[PDB]
Amino acid sequence: DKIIHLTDDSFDTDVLKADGAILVDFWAEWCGPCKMIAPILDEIADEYQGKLTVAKLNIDQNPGTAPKYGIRGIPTLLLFKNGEVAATKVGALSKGQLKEFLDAALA
Ligand SMILES: [Cu+2]
Ligand SMILES: [Cu+2]
């Protein structure tokens, strides 16, 4: 319930005008690894409450956002700070590896 489902249009407000950190998961229904990381993202959203918003963007229903960031495939994670990309990860990760990524990305 802490996870935000973005559209191409709502991205322009909820991400670009937001101070704070937002982890955006670019995914699609056909993508197996994307679906598998979904429970990890739920856990992160709870654990990082007050620190990080977790958001998802379904690239087939929202084809405009990924090209703006040069995203070539899914799953891809973009960590925004204050409306700008602050870190990226292409590919799926274990929970422990995702937390390592976040330690570095939030620093
Ligand atoms: Cu919930
Ligand atoms: Cu939930």
Numbering used by the authors: 2 to 108
Reproduce text from the manuscript describing this model.
Thioredoxins (TRX) are small globular proteins of about 100–110 residues, which are conserved in all living organisms. They participate in multiple critical redox-reactions via the reversible oxidation of the active site CXXC catalytic motif1. Two TRX forms were described in Escherichia coli, Trx1 and Trx22. The former, called EcTRX throughout this work, is a widely used experimental model for investigating the molecular basis of protein stability, folding and function.
The N106A variant was designed to eliminate a hydrogen bond linking the side-chain of Asn106 with the carbonyl oxygen of Phe102, thus N106A is expected to destabilize the native structure. The three-dimensional structure of this variant reveals that the hydrogen bond partner of Phe102 is now the main-chain of residue 106, through its amide nitrogen. A slight distortion of the main-chain of the CTH is produced to satisfy the hydrogen bond distance for this interaction. These results are consistent with the very low effect on global stability (ΔΔG°NU = 0.3 kcal mol−1) observed for this mutation. The N106A mutant exhibits a large cavity of 166 Å2 for chain A or 130 Å2 for chain B. Electron density compatible with an ethanol molecule, used as a precipitant, was detected inside this cavity. More likely, the ethanol molecule establishes a hydrogen bond with Leu94. Therefore, we speculate that this cavity of EcTRX is highly dynamic, in such a way that it connects the protein core with the bulk solvent, allowing the entrance of the ethanol molecule. Another significant difference between wild-type and N106A is the distance between loop elements centered in positions 20 and 83, which results in the wild-type structure in a slightly “open” conformation (for instance, the distance from Cα 20 to Cα 83 is 7.4 and 4.3 Å for wild-type and N106A, respectively). For variant N106A, the drop was a 1:1 mix of protein (10 mg/ml) and reservoir solution (100 mM sodium acetate, 4 mM CuSO4, 25% ethanol, pH 4.25).
